[PDB]
């Protein structure tokens, strides 16, 4: 069992930045991938960014060059650096591993302008 804890979020303006963290606990050596997902009302949970153990990453085209996913190997934390924020980034953000299934509670992000 691996436990994931989302922290961060907030209310931002178009152009500002937020930093979300995802802290893993438990049998983290069986985790080879970590991803951030987001959801909006009426729409479906969609991928934002993913990172694997070697540090390679993929990004949704809507957040490429604005969002950055990174990891702290010593603290078992995956960060979502949300820069250059737009109103489209308003969503509840969720952390998940490569094993499909149990989500954390997520955290909320609102971007106004
Ligand atoms: C894509 C992510 C990834 O590869 N990980 C990760 C997972 C969740 C959240 C942050 C990072 C690793 C998990 C294992 N930790 C080391 C702990 C360890 C190592 C060796 C033996 C025993 C214990 C290194 C990072």
Author numbering: 1 to 113
Give sentences from the paper.
We next decided to investigate the structure and detailed interactions of the N76D mutation. As observed for JGFN4 WT, we obtained monomeric and dimeric forms of JGFN4 N76D when it was expressed in E. coli. Both species yielded crystals in the presence of fentanyl, and the structures were determined at 1.60 and 1.85-Å resolution. In contrast to our predictions, however, the structure for the crystals grown with monomeric JGFN4 N76D was found to be a monomer with bound fentanyl. Thus, it appears that the N76D mutation alleviates the need for JGFN4 dimerization via domain swapping in fentanyl binding. A comparison of the electrostatic surface potential for JGFN4 WT and JGFN4 N76D bound to fentanyl showed that the binding pocket of JGFN4 WT was narrower and less negatively charged compared to the strong negative charge in JGFN4 N76D. It was found that the substituted D76 side chain forms a hydrogen bond not only with the tertiary amine nitrogen of the piperidine moiety but also with the side chain of T28 from CDR1. N76 and T28 are ∼1.0 Å farther apart in the wild-type structure. This shift also brings the T28 side chain closer by ∼1.0 Å to the piperidine ring of fentanyl. Unlike the wild type, JGFN4 N76D was able to bind fentanyl as a monomer.
